[PDB]
Design a protein around this ligand. Structure first.
Ligand SMILES: [Ca+2]
Ligand SMILES: [Ca+2]
Ligand SMILES: [Ca+2]
Length: 153
């Protein structure tokens, strides 16, 4: 699938930047601009793979000594003239070295998986769910912005 290929290219670029010894890694994975008609399950797979990929990102950045890691994920299935069905998802995460040090992998994986499960449940059920989220821990230098908008006609 296209989502799996995008995830593989992102993995390879992340590993290439790790091997080169970078202290500032900025990974941005954007699903191609498509319509909601046929791509909803593929977008759900894209979100699931990005969620599973951020957990590996955090470990491989902390062990490599990365000083600042930014992971950005974006999917936008736009509505057609016929329906109001739409699926917008944007998740940006910025972690400093202390942030990478203080991340509990278990709680992080649980949070990502619960968020994705709620997204999948809302998308499958044809329900409306819109939420924005901005978090900033200044002491540990952890920040994230998340915007999700799920509409079923
Ligand atoms: Ca609805
Ligand atoms: Ca709105
Ligand atoms: Ca609205």
């Amino acid at each position: 699938s296209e989502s799996k290929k995008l995830i593989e290219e992102a993995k390879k670029e992340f590993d290439k930047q790790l091997a080169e010894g970078k202290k500032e890694i900025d990974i941005e994975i954007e699903y191609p601009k498509k319509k909601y008609d046929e791509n909803y399950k593929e977008a759900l797979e894209f979100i699931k793979l990005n969620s599973e990929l951020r957990v590996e990102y955090v470990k491989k950045s902390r062990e490599a000594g990365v000083e600042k890691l930014t992971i950005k994920t974006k999917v936008k299935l736009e509505p057609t003239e016929n329906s109001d069905h739409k699926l917008d998802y944007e998740y940006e995460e910025e972690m400093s070295k202390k942030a990478l040090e203080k991340t509990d992998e278990k709680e992080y994986k649980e949070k990502l998986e619960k968020e994705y499960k709620k997204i999948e449940e809302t998308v499958e059920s044809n329900k409306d769910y819109e939420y924005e989220e901005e978090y900033e821990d200044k002491e540990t230098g952890y920040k994230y912005k998340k915007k999700v908008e799920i509409k079923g006609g």
